[PDB]
Design a protein around this ligand. Structure first.
Ligand SMILES: [Zn+2]
Ligand SMILES: [Zn+2]
Lengths: 472, 473
C-alpha cells in the first residue's frame, strides 16, 4: 500500500509521536513531534520521505512541541486546531506556512488522506486525526491518531486547565465535552486503529496501557470510560483519582501556545574544564545539577547541588524540581551529557550554560563540597528508641495511608520544595521512600536548603518492613 | 491493564518480533525472536520482566531463530508447532524445557493468555498466536500474532517448500490450506490486531505493507487475499508474481528445524592487525568480504575480495552471494564491524574468522590488490558505436522487459554466480543496473572470477535514459 507509518516513543515523558507518509510521492508528516526533530528528519531521509507538515493534536502540557522546530528546519506547514476559544489559539503559526484546522477539514499528502475530528475533553481545542489510504481504500478509515483524547485503557484528564491555568469550573465543562466526544468515537468502525499521544506512566491520565496501541472495537469493550451511559456519573468518575498536576505544566501550555524558542537560538551548551579553582564561581553562578547515581553523589558532591540521577525518571523530577528562570550548570559523564541536555530541553529548561564530567568533584575544595549519609534501617531503628531522628517520608499520600515509620513526617517529594521551611535545619533529618529513589533526590534538596545532618534510608520502607520492624 | 507488548524490527530482513509480558508477575515471552537475543533480555531487565518462553510461529526460511539462543541464555521454554508432518518437526527442543503445540492449546504467562491457532499456508506447521488480557477481559481477544500467515495487505507465499526443499506439488497444496486458514482468520472479531512476523521488503510475500500492523476488520476489507471467494482462482493468484527464493532459505529451514549452533559455541571474531605482509595469506585463507562503499572499493581492494557495501541491503546480498561452508575474512570499520558480524550471523554465515579496518588495503602489495573503473554513460555510449564493450545488465527480469541498453546481456545479480562462465574473461565487460548499487556488487564478483577489464556505469540505466541515450525493448 506504499504507505509508511512509524511510532516514536519517549520513555521518559511516556509520549508517542508518528511519522506518516506516502512512499509513492514521498510526502510525509509528523503527528505531535518532540522538540528534538532529528529522529524524524533522519528517518524520513533514509526512507526517502519529505516532511511537509507537522500536526499537533493539542497544546501540550508536559513537553515542548516540535511543530515550530519542524516549521523551521524542514520548511513544513504548522497544522493546528482553530477550534479552541480565543485564549487557546496558536497565532504564532501565521508567520509560517500553516493550517488552522476545523472539524471535517482534510489534509492530503499523496495517497495519505487525513480528516480532522474535533474531540474536546483533554483540552478545548483538541482534535484527532482519522487516516485513510487513498490509493487502496479512500472511504475506509484505517487509524485514529487519538492524541490525549482516547488512550489504551483510559481517556485524557480534563482538569489541567483548572489546575495550572486557573480557569474556574472548566474541569466539569471539559469532562462533559469528553463524554460528548466519546460518542463520536464509538460511531467509528471497530477495525479502526487507535494511536494515542501518550502511554503507561504519563501524568496526562490515570491508568494508561503498556501496550502501544488498541482499536475502536477493543476500547468499546474494555475501556472504563466507554462503559458509562450517565454523563453526571461519568464526570464523577473522570475527576476522581487523577494524578497531581506538575507545576511546570503551566509553562508548557504557554510556550506551546505562543511558540517555543528555536534550539538553534539557545545554542550548544559548551563543555567546560572545571579545575578546583573554578568550582565556587560555578556553584555561585547558578543551579548545579548532578546526574550521577545517588550512591556516588552522596559521598561527594558540590555543596548546594541537586541530584536527579540519570534514568527513566529523570525528566519527571527535572520537571517537578528545576526552574526555567535560572541558568543550569550540569555535571554529567561525557557519554550521556547530550542526552541529558536534550531531556532538559524537552521540558523547556533551556538555559543550560555549560557542563563537565563529574570527576570535577574529586579534587574540589573542602568549602565547595558536601555529603549525606546512606544509612540502613538497623541504624535508623537504634536512633528510634531515644527518638534521635526527625523522620521524613517523601512517598505519595496513598502509600503513607497504608503505613509509615513511627513518628515519621509526611511531605511527598513533589511538594518538598514548598514546605521545606517546615523541616528543622539543626535536627538530624532521616529521609525515606518505598525503595530509595525519591529519598535520594530529597536528600540533595535537604542539604541544599541547609539541613546539615541528613541521612537517607537505604532500601526504604520495604527494607524496613522486610526486616520485621514496626510500622504505624 | 499491566500488560506489556513491544515490537522489535530488523530493517534488513524486514522481520518483526515481539516481547509480550505481564507487568504484575513479570512473566514474559518473545515471539519469533532474532538469533541475537540481547535486545530482548536488555529490554526485559529494564522493564522488570523475565522471559520464560520463546514462541515460533513457523520454521523460518529467511533467518536463524533465536529460540534456542533464548532457551540457553534465559532458561526459556521453546514453544513450537507440532502440527507439521514428520519431516517438519522440531525434535531438538526436547532437550530443553519446551512445549509441542497443537491447535487450541494455551500458554499462560501471568495475566497473559495466548491461544494457539493452526494456520497452515506459508508452511504446513505454521501457527498464529491469539492474545487475551486475563486481568481485564479474559474472553475478549486483543491481538493476533499472525507470523507469516497474514501480513498487512498480503499473506505468506506458499511455495518455499517446493522451491527450496524439493517438495513437488506442495505449493498448490499449501496454497489451498492458506485459503482454508483464511476462513478462520475472518471468523475473528474485527477489532483484533494483526501483528505479523514480516514487513515491506521481505521475500516471504508479494507486496507487504510499510505500516507495522493492521486489524482483522481492515484486512477483511482491503487485503487482496480476503476478497477471493473461489479457491481455484486464489491458488492461481497466490502463486503468480512471488519474488525469487534465495538459495540460502534451504539452509535456514534446516538450521531452525535441527536447532541452530549457539553463538557462544562460535565465539567472537578476532580483531586482527593486517600489515601488507599478512595480506596474501589472508586472501588465500578464505573469502574476503569488504563492506566499504563501492566507490572506495572500486579504486583499491584486495584482489578476489567481494564488496557488499554496508547499508539496508547488506543482508539481502550476503544471503544471495556468500557461502556458509567457507571461512570469512571481513574488512569493516571498527565502528560498524560488530553490527556487520551480527548481520551475518542472523542469516547463518557463522565462520567469520577475523576482521580488520579497511585501511589495511592502503599499503597492500600490488600483486594483492585490484580495481575496476567507474565510468559515465557518455563513456559507455562512445564505446558503443564500435561495440568495444560487452554489456551486462544485472536487473530483474521485469526491469529488463521495460528496456535495456543496446546489445546488452541479461543476468540478474541473484543469478550472476551460476552463469558467470557465460561472461568472457578477456572482453571489456561493462556492467549496469537501475541506479548503480547492484552493479557495483556485480563488478567485484566479476573481478573475482578473473575478468580483467571491468567497468561499472555510474548512475545506471536511469542516468543513461536521463541523458536521452538509446534504449532497446
Ligand atoms: Zn496532553
Ligand atoms: Zn517465513
Amino acid at each position: 500500500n506504499a504507505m509508511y507509518l512509524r511510532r516514536f516513543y519517549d520513555e521518559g515523558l511516556a509520549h508517542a509521536s508518528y511519522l506518516v507518509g506516502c512512499q509513492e510521492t514521498g510526502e510525509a508528516c509528523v503527528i505531535d513531534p518532540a522538540r528534538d526533530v532529528e529522529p524524524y528528519l533522519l528517518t524520513a531521509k533514509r526512507e526517502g520521505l519529505r516532511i511537509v507538515a507537522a500536526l499537533e493534536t493539542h497544546i501540550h502540557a508536559d513537553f515542548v512541541s516540535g511543530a515550530r522546530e519542524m516549521a523551521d528546519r524542514a520548511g513544513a506547514a504548522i497544522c493546528v486546531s482553530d477550534e479552541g476559544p480565543p485564549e487557546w489559539k496558536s497565532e504564532y503559526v501565521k508567520a509560517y506556512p500553516h493550517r488552522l484546522l476545523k472539524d471535517g477539514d482534510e489534509l492530503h499528502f499523496g495517497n495519505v488522506r487525513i480528516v480532522v475530528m474535533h474531540t474536546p475533553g483533554h483540552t478545548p481545542e483538541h482534535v484527532s486525526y482519522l487516516l485513510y489510504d487513498g490509493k487502496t481504500s479512500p472511504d475506509v478509515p484505517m487509524a485514529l491518531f487519538s492524541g490525549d483524547f482516547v488512550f489504551v485503557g483510559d481517556v485524557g484528564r480534563p482538569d489541567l486547565l483548572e489546575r495550572v491555568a486557573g480557569e474556574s469550573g472548566s474541569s466539569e465543562a471539559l469532562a462533559r465535552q469528553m463524554f460528548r466526544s466519546l460518542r463520536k468515537f464509538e460511531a467509528l468502525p471497530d477495525h479502526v486503529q487507535v494511536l494515542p499521544a501518550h502511554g503507561a506512566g504519563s501524568a496526562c491520565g490515570k491508568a494508561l496501557g503498556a501496550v502501544p496501541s488498541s482499536t475502536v472495537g477493543y476500547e468499546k469493550l474494555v475501556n472504563w470510560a466507554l462503559q458509562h451511559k450517565d454523563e453526571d456519573a461519568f464526570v464523577q468518575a473522570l475527576l476522581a483519582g487523577q494524578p497531581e498536576a506538575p507545576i511546570y505544566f503551566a509553562r508548557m501550555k504557554l510556550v506551546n501556545k505562543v511558540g517555543p524558542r528555536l534550539l538553534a537560538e539557545l545554542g550548544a551548551p559548551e563543555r567546560v574544564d572545571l579545575p578546583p579553582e573554578r568550582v565556587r564561581a560555578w556553584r555561585e553562578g547558578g543551579v548545579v545539577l548532578d546526574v550521577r547515581p545517588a550512591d556516588a553523589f552522596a559521598k561527594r558532591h558540590l555543596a548546594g547541588s541537586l541530584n536527579i540521577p540519570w534514568n527513566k525518571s529523570f525528566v519527571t523530577w527535572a520537571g517537578w524540581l528545576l526552574p526555567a528562570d535560572r541558568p543550569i550548570h550540569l555535571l554529567a559523564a561525557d557519554a550521556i551529557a547530550p542526552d541529558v541536555i536534550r531531556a532538559l530541553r524537552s521540558i523547556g529548561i533551556d538555559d543550560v550554560v555549560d557542563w563537565t564530567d563529574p570527576a570535577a568533584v574529586d579534587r574540589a575544595a573542602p568549602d565547595d563540597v558536601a555529603s549525606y549519609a546512606n544509612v540502613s534501617p538497623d541504624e535508623v531503628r537504634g536512633a528510634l528508641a531515644q527518638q534521635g531522628l526527625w523522620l521524613l517520608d517523601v512517598r505519595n499520600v496513598d502509600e503513607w495511608a497504608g503505613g509509615h515509620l513511627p513518628q515519621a513526617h509526611h511531605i511527598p517529594l513533589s511538594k518538598l520544595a514548598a514546605h521545606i521551611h517546615d523541616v528543622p535545619r539543626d535536627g538530624s533529618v532521616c529521609v525515606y521512600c518505598r525503595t530509595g529513589g525519591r529519598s535520594a533526590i530529597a536528600a540533595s534538596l535537604l542539604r541544599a536548603h541547609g539541613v546539615g545532618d541528613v541521612r537517607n534510608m537505604v532500601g526504604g520502607y520495604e527494607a524496613w518492613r522486610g526486616k520485621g520492624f514496626p510500622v504505624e
